[PDB]
Amino acid sequence: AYTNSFTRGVYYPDKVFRSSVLHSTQDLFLPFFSNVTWFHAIHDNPVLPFNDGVYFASTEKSNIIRGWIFGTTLDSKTQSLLIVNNATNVVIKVCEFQFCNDPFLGVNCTFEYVSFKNLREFVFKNIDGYFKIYSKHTPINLVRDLPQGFSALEPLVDLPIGINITRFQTLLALHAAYYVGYLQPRTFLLKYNENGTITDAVDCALDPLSE
Amino acid sequence: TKCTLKSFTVEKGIYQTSNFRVQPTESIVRFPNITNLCPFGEVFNATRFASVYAWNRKRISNCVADYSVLYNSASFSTFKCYGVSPTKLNDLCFTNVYADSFVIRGDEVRQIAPGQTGKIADYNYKLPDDFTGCVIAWNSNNLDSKGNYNYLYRKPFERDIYFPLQSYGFQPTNVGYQPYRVVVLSFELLHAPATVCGPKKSTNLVKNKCVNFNFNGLTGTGVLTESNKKFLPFQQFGRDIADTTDAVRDPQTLEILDITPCSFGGVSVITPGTNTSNQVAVLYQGVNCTEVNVFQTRAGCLIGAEHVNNSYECDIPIGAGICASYQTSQSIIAYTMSLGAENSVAYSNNSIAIPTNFTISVTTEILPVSMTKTSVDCTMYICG
Amino acid sequence: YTMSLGAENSVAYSNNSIAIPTNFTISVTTEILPVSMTKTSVDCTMYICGDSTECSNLLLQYGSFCTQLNRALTGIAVEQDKNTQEVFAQVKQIYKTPPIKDFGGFNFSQILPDPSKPSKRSFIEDLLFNKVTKFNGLTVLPPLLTDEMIAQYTSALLAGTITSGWTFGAGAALQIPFAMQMAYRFNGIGVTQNVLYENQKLIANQFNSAIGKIQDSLSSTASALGKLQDVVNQNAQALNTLVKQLSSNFGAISSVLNDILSRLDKVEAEVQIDRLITGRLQSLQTYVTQQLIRAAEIRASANLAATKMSECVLGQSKRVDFCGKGYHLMSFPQSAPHGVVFLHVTYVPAQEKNFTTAPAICHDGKAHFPREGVFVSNGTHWFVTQRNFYEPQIITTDNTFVSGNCDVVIGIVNNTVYDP
Amino acid sequence: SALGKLQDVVNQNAQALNTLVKQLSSNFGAISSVLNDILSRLDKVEAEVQIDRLITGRLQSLQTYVTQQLIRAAEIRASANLAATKMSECVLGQSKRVDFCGKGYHLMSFPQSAPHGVVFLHVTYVPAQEKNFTTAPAICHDGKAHFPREGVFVSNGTHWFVTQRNFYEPQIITTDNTFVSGNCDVVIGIVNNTVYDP
Amino acid sequence: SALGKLQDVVNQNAQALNTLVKQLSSNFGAISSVLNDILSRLDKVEAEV
Numbered sequence A: 001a002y003t004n005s006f007t008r009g010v011y012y013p014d015k016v017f018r019s020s021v022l023h024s025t026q027d028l029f030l031p032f033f034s035n036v037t038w039f040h041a042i043h044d045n046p047v048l049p050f051n052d053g054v055y056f057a058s059t060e061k062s063n064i065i066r067g068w069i070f071g072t073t074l075d076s077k078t079q080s081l082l083i084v085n086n087a088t089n090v091v092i093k094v095c096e097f098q099f100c101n102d103p104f105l106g107v108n109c110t111f112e113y114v115s116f117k118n119l120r121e122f123v124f125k126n127i128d129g130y131f132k133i134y135s136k137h138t139p140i141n142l143v144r145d146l147p148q149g150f151s152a153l154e155p156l157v158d159l160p161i162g163i164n165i166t167r168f169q170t171l172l173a174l175h176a177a178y179y180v181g182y183l184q185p186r187t188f189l190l191k192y193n194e195n196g197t198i199t200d201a202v203d204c205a206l207d208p209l210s211e
Numbered sequence B: 001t002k003c004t005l006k007s008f009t010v011e012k013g014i015y016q017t018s019n020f021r022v023q024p025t026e027s028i029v030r031f032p033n034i035t036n037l038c039p040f041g042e043v044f045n046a047t048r049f050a051s052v053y054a055w056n057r058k059r060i061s062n063c064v065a066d067y068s069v070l071y072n073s074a075s076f077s078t079f080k081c082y083g084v085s086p087t088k089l090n091d092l093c094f095t096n097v098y099a100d101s102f103v104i105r106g107d108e109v110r111q112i113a114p115g116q117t118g119k120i121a122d123y124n125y126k127l128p129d130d131f132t133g134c135v136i137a138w139n140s141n142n143l144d145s146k147g148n149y150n151y152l153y154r155k156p157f158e159r160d161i162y163f164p165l166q167s168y169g170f171q172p173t174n175v176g177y178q179p180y181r182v183v184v185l186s187f188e189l190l191h192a193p194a195t196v197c198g199p200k201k202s203t204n205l206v207k208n209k210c211v212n213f214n215f216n217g218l219t220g221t222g223v224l225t226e227s228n229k230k231f232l233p234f235q236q237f238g239r240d241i242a243d244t245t246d247a248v249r250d251p252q253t254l255e256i257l258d259i260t261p262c263s264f265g266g267v268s269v270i271t272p273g274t275n276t277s278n279q280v281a282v283l284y285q286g287v288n289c290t291e292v293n294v295f296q297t298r299a300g301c302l303i304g305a306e307h308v309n310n311s312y313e314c315d316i317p318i319g320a321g322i323c324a325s326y327q328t329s330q331s332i333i334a335y336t337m338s339l340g341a342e343n344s345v346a347y348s349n350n351s352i353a354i355p356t357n358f359t360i361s362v363t364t365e366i367l368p369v370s371m372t373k374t375s376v377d378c379t380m381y382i383c384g
Numbered sequence C: 001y002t003m004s005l006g007a008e009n010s011v012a013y014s015n016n017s018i019a020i021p022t023n024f025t026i027s028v029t030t031e032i033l034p035v036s037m038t039k040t041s042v043d044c045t046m047y048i049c050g051d052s053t054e055c056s057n058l059l060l061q062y063g064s065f066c067t068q069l070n071r072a073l074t075g076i077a078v079e080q081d082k083n084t085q086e087v088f089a090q091v092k093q094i095y096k097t098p099p100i101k102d103f104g105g106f107n108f109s110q111i112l113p114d115p116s117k118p119s120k121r122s123f124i125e126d127l128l129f130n131k132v133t134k135f136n137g138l139t140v141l142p143p144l145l146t147d148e149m150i151a152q153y154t155s156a157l158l159a160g161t162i163t164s165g166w167t168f169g170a171g172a173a174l175q176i177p178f179a180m181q182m183a184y185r186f187n188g189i190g191v192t193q194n195v196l197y198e199n200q201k202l203i204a205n206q207f208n209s210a211i212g213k214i215q216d217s218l219s220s221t222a223s224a225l226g227k228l229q230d231v232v233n234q235n236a237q238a239l240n241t242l243v244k245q246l247s248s249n250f251g252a253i254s255s256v257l258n259d260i261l262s263r264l265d266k267v268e269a270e271v272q273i274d275r276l277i278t279g280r281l282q283s284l285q286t287y288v289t290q291q292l293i294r295a296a297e298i299r300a301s302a303n304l305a306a307t308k309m310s311e312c313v314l315g316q317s318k319r320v321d322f323c324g325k326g327y328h329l330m331s332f333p334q335s336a337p338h339g340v341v342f343l344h345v346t347y348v349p350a351q352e353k354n355f356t357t358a359p360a361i362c363h364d365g366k367a368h369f370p371r372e373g374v375f376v377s378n379g380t381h382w383f384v385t386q387r388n389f390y391e392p393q394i395i396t397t398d399n400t401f402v403s404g405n406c407d408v409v410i411g412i413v414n415n416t417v418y419d420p
Numbered sequence D: 001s002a003l004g005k006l007q008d009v010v011n012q013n014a015q016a017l018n019t020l021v022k023q024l025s026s027n028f029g030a031i032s033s034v035l036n037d038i039l040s041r042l043d044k045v046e047a048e049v050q051i052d053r054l055i056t057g058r059l060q061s062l063q064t065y066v067t068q069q070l071i072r073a074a075e076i077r078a079s080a081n082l083a084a085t086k087m088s089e090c091v092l093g094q095s096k097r098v099d100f101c102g103k104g105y106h107l108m109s110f111p112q113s114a115p116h117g118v119v120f121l122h123v124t125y126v127p128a129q130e131k132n133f134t135t136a137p138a139i140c141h142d143g144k145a146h147f148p149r150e151g152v153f154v155s156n157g158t159h160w161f162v163t164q165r166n167f168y169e170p171q172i173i174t175t176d177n178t179f180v181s182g183n184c185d186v187v188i189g190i191v192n193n194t195v196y197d198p
Numbered sequence E: 001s002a003l004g005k006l007q008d009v010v011n012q013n014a015q016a017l018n019t020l021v022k023q024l025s026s027n028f029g030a031i032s033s034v035l036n037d038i039l040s041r042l043d044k045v046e047a048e049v
């Protein structure tokens, strides 16, 4: 299935405060009004290509989507990133020990790391040897789909994993709905308000008005 | 004023001689209050280095780094640095440092720079074509040679795992064909919280007064003041239109401070002609007089002139309706200019004034028509 | 669409047809002129080098560039006060209006000063002040005249123009009743001055109502201030571009000068900083070149405004369409931020009638020609009348002069010509 | 100081030339500003880098001079077209343009040459010695309003005269001085008198 | 040559455009004035100079 991304998927491009300014930026971003591929947790987690990078989200009140995998083979023929949330921690690995090859969770650690009524959002991208993750959590009353309204994602972590990534997958937990949208190299214009929160954005390659 | 004009005679006027700036009272250093020594002895005197086909990486964080001990070590055959100088590494600090650690043949060390390509550098270890940091390397032939074919070779910062498996006969009798241990230090010069910093000691913090300052390596000069700015937890710095840092989060108390540049302005020297007096009056443009006889104008603080309640024609213009002149036992007066003699015209619906007599004026209007016909033989001007 | 150039009009020409206006409209066609851009000035060493001694010692190697940029910007900044003084200070006395406003029915109470204001602008000057809207070594110097002094000069010019007309341009101001001044201005446009008195209340009401439409136009419509707001916006965008250019790399490792001086030792830092100097200096020379060419454009506008003040306020202009689209009567200056506004009062003819006409008239075989105006007939009787307001008069030896026998003239007509 | 407009044009060009000449002595980041030093001290590879800094700097300084001189030449050309316009309207003619031909009502102008410019001796009538008079827009006679052909009506206090606008020359009011238009009652502030029929 | 001012205005603007077009062929101290010669001959870091 498909649905419209609207204006969602913008994130803070750098760790610098600014306020009352229209700062321009060029980066991998989710193109405005692009189609997101859409999925249901019940009765749906294939492997997808990763491309330039991946926006991801889930609409929730049950916490069934709980992780991600990124790599080229995703099966320990070669090393691949694993991410899990376990309701006390965020946990990250590249270890060689074999994964759940038909992935769901039952309710050489050469890199290892540890830290509907909601929409949870992410942006995942790989540049020059560093993987990067951004996020947002927000309440929703619109149980139906991604809101036609604006909020911006903020960086969680930078991960110097050095691994080649060209495919990804998502992990579900059992004894909800989730989305995928590919990023592209885009110029964007951002508005930072008087408090230095991004209240609006423009995708400079959307349409002649945005150009 | 005489040096501004390069002239021993100065006519009656007002001359923009100089740029007054309030000076930095003292130097302030603000660094993270953390004291653990960084693991460089583990990095450089490791049990073994990695093979370059699958180079080691170590993360350095939450520690103090005296790079002078490394830079002064004559054991290093090279210490090539990019975007920083080896002498400056203590003066400045970072969100993380990464050490990439591996062995190569000495003939290949020329491939480890932010722009190269080659049978190592387009393959198993590529630096970004704009990387910032230092490459530190030396011959390890006294330890790593045997030959020691356990040492093995083959996007920026790509790791990888006919087949391209190739190895080096490192023997103690080899000189370009010796093993060389290399550590590349990549410095994460982003605007997160700093966690790797030099041994440079923090001072106490000073506020509302002009100071020289450092915050985590942001050297500058300005008035530090407490601020209302709602910095998000991931941002350590804030910037104005000019990319100049406008605010900082303090690395020890984590409060948000404005930086305001110390009070400044032009120093317009009001003078009568030197062919009339040596006496002068100084307009500190735009400044408040509390920051510098004295008088305050909307144009700035005026010193050495004398304020007068009478009004006269504007002899020397100062600004915002103030003018000055040298007058009577004599001083430079400053006054609100007369626009002219005030005149209530004797109007009524039935009164007219008719001139019973005239005069013939002869005025004199003096118009430029031609500047000098200069021409420059531009090849002879440039190349003589 | 293909643009309309205007409504098409077959002018109803023929060798014997004339259209004469039988009535007029007084119109207060506002004109706006810039006079002085912002008196910007730059500490070119604080802009280029940010109080680094390490950078200033390199900027010295470029010689008299930084000093001639200060010299050039000072040449603009001092001539903004020349412009403002040449436009407004055309009077060596501050005239003031009488306590009683007995101006024959005209109501200047919206264009004269109001004591209710903290700086004593008029009402229309106060509308104009509503409609018109760093630390980086840049500065803005104040104007020499305050906006209060500017408002005293526009009040002197205007209290002169009201109580004394053109006469204060020549000698000292000579008082004259305003109803007698307009009977000069009507002779200046070739309208016989009894056309004022025989319509005086109407003309006063058309002036008062036209002034009222200027209050509504300026209150409702921001695009009236188009030129002045554009001159503020051009200088604001020029300064904001000059400030943004401090963030440009110009090929250096960073655009924040203290990044280079903290990261690099002097031997390497001197290479990178010379790119920031080369770039920031090229951008300062670009800004000063733009400001010099723009200051020449504002100086052309200031010399135009000073010419309009001299001919159109201090006098009456015979120069067609110089003083708004009509036959010019008088103008009232009003100040506005960075400029001036002229309320050009103009006679525009309106309610036309067609008439049969002739270049001359025969009487006793001798051709008569009009002294003032033209010949016309309503269809049955022949009259002489002034060119710009239909006022038919019996044709006589007093409004006409002879020149020889009829036979030489193409299109002469017979009539009687009467002898008083 | 009356010559300030011309002496300042000479000074601006002389200061621009001295600035342009001094810029030959500026290093622009080369080891010397005297080109012959670079060519005598350095061999013809190393010298070719240093000379490129002098060419870059001197050429930028020549373009700075020529840009300044083009903008200044346009500033003089506006003054030359203004001077040519005063020559045409104010010397070759007489100007109705108030305060174009100097202060006053303009009579004639005599041009005089000056170094780099021109001087106009604008001769102007300036009215000087007022008297205050009672005045009226019009005068009634036999029910007819009368208005002046040239000038204005005035009274010293007891007799009514017509006189030209710009020089008090009182004349007995007559039908040769004045024109009729309609009845009295329309005119705000018409006065009675007698208008004489010559 | 009665049109001398307008022919001068056309000539100035055409010579200004022909000057600006010819200035694409000027070397300015680079190994070629044809940008694609630099991008074909040099590896794309040395080429930045």
Ligand SMILES: *[C@@H]1O[C@H](CO)[C@@H](O[C@@H]2O[C@H](CO)[C@@H](O)[C@H](O)[C@H]2NC(C)=O)[C@H](O)[C@H]1NC(C)=O
Pocket (backbone or CB within 6 Å): A072, A164, A165, A166, B155, B158, B160
């Ligand atoms: C990253 O992974 C992709 C595969 O997902 C690699 O691309 C393949 O590379 C081989 C040669 O090594 C080609 O023959 C294939 O045609 C490529 N396939 C695709 C889909 O592009 C890629 O080389 C890997 N890159 C790195 C730096 O490891």
Ligand SMILES: *[C@@H]1O[C@H](CO)[C@@H](O[C@@H]2O[C@H](CO)[C@@H](O)[C@H](O)[C@H]2NC(C)=O)[C@H](O)[C@H]1NC(C)=O
Pocket (backbone or CB within 6 Å): C107, C109, C110
């Ligand atoms: C001149 O015009 C002004 C307004 O342009 C008139 O002001 C009005 O005055 C009366 C009291 O006399 C008030 O009731 C009105 O509200 C005022 N109007 C405004 C808009 O302020 C003034 O009366 C006029 N005077 C003459 C003699 O015409």
Ligand SMILES: *[C@@H]1O[C@H](CO)[C@@H](O[C@@H]2O[C@H](CO)[C@@H](O)[C@H](O)[C@H]2NC(C)=O)[C@H](O)[C@H]1NC(C)=O
Pocket (backbone or CB within 6 Å): C022, C023, C024, C025, C202, C205, C206, C351
């Ligand atoms: C000349 O035109 C004006 C309008 O511009 C006429 O004045 C109006 O006359 C009507 C009645 O005819 C009144 O209702 C309006 O109030 C008048 N307007 C003003 C501003 O007073 C005027 O009557 C015309 N005169 C002639 C001779 O045609």
Ligand SMILES: *[C@@H]1O[C@H](CO)[C@@H](O[C@@H]2O[C@H](CO)[C@@H](O)[C@H](O)[C@H]2NC(C)=O)[C@H](O)[C@H]1NC(C)=O
Pocket (backbone or CB within 6 Å): C378, C379, C380, C381
């Ligand atoms: C042309 O104008 C004349 C004068 O205004 C008109 O002649 C008058 O006409 C009325 C009757 O309409 C008579 O009472 C007058 O005695 C006439 N005056 C004279 C001097 O003879 C004439 O009617 C007008 N004609 C047109 C076609 O409008």
Ligand SMILES: *[C@@H]1O[C@H](CO)[C@@H](O[C@@H]2O[C@H](CO)[C@@H](O)[C@H](O)[C@H]2NC(C)=O)[C@H](O)[C@H]1NC(C)=O
Pocket (backbone or CB within 6 Å): C362, C412, C413, C414
């Ligand atoms: C004006 O009136 C005169 C008579 O007063 C006309 O002159 C006559 O014209 C005819 C035809 O050309 C001749 O036969 C007569 O001999 C002329 N008489 C005189 C006394 O000259 C004249 O034609 C009229 N013109 C117009 C334009 O109406």
Ligand SMILES: *[C@@H]1O[C@H](CO)[C@@H](O[C@@H]2O[C@H](CO)[C@@H](O)[C@H](O)[C@H]2NC(C)=O)[C@H](O)[C@H]1NC(C)=O
Pocket (backbone or CB within 6 Å): D156, D157, D158, D159
């Ligand atoms: C106003 O002007 C008239 C004419 O100049 C003066 O009238 C004359 O006064 C003298 C005596 O001073 C008499 O001899 C003349 O006969 C008068 N002339 C006429 C036409 O009557 C008059 O005195 C002046 N009044 C004032 C107040 O100056």
Ligand SMILES: *[C@@H]1O[C@H](CO)[C@@H](O[C@@H]2O[C@H](CO)[C@@H](O)[C@H](O)[C@H]2NC(C)=O)[C@H](O)[C@H]1NC(C)=O
Pocket (backbone or CB within 6 Å): D140, D190, D191, D192
């Ligand atoms: C001008 O003189 C006339 C008389 O020649 C004056 O007219 C008289 O005015 C009064 C008051 O309005 C009336 O009672 C009389 O009936 C009028 N007389 C006539 C014959 O109409 C007129 O008032 C005078 N005006 C001025 C301004 O002096």
Ligand SMILES: *[C@@H]1O[C@H](CO)[C@@H](O)[C@H](O)[C@H]1NC(C)=O
Pocket (backbone or CB within 6 Å): A002, A033, A034, A035
């Ligand atoms: C989105 O997908 C629909 C079909 O689901 C397709 O018709 C449409 O062209 C797509 N639009 C974009 C912008 O990808």
Ligand SMILES: *[C@@H]1O[C@H](CO)[C@@H](O)[C@H](O)[C@H]1NC(C)=O
Pocket (backbone or CB within 6 Å): A086, A087, A088, A089, A091, A114
């Ligand atoms: C979550 O993961 C961390 C690291 O694996 C572990 O210490 C923690 O106990 C886990 N929590 C649960 C609830 O299992």
Ligand SMILES: *[C@@H]1O[C@H](CO)[C@@H](O)[C@H](O)[C@H]1NC(C)=O
Pocket (backbone or CB within 6 Å): A096, A097, A108
């Ligand atoms: C760990 O890595 C080495 C190669 O670096 C490999 O030989 C070994 O088999 C790996 N161990 C596991 C458990 O996969």
Ligand SMILES: *[C@@H]1O[C@H](CO)[C@@H](O)[C@H](O)[C@H]1NC(C)=O
Pocket (backbone or CB within 6 Å): A193, A194, A195
């Ligand atoms: C900034 O944040 C405060 C709450 O901390 C809020 O009251 C204010 O409205 C915000 N600013 C804007 C522009 O809404």
Ligand SMILES: *[C@@H]1O[C@H](CO)[C@@H](O)[C@H](O)[C@H]1NC(C)=O
Pocket (backbone or CB within 6 Å): B040, B041, B044, B045
């Ligand atoms: C490595 O060990 C030697 C002694 O074997 C010591 O002198 C040197 O300081 C050590 N290197 C570092 C980086 O500490």
Ligand SMILES: *[C@@H]1O[C@H](CO)[C@@H](O)[C@H](O)[C@H]1NC(C)=O
Pocket (backbone or CB within 6 Å): B033, B252, B253
């Ligand atoms: C840092 O050190 C100061 C004393 O120098 C102490 O008061 C402060 O609480 C410390 N801050 C943190 C974040 O530990």
Ligand SMILES: *[C@@H]1O[C@H](CO)[C@@H](O)[C@H](O)[C@H]1NC(C)=O
Pocket (backbone or CB within 6 Å): B275, B276
């Ligand atoms: C300057 O002073 C000298 C005497 O020292 C005098 O002769 C000359 O006239 C003065 N000039 C001015 C402009 O004051």
Ligand SMILES: *[C@@H]1O[C@H](CO)[C@@H](O)[C@H](O)[C@H]1NC(C)=O
Pocket (backbone or CB within 6 Å): B288, B289, B290, B296
């Ligand atoms: C000048 O500065 C003092 C504080 O030092 C302040 O109280 C005063 O209001 C200021 N006055 C002006 C005109 O800036």
Ligand SMILES: *[C@@H]1O[C@H](CO)[C@@H](O)[C@H](O)[C@H]1NC(C)=O
Pocket (backbone or CB within 6 Å): B307, B308, B309
């Ligand atoms: C100027 O006048 C004011 C009162 O208007 C007075 O208080 C003040 O002392 C006077 N200043 C001087 C310098 O005489």
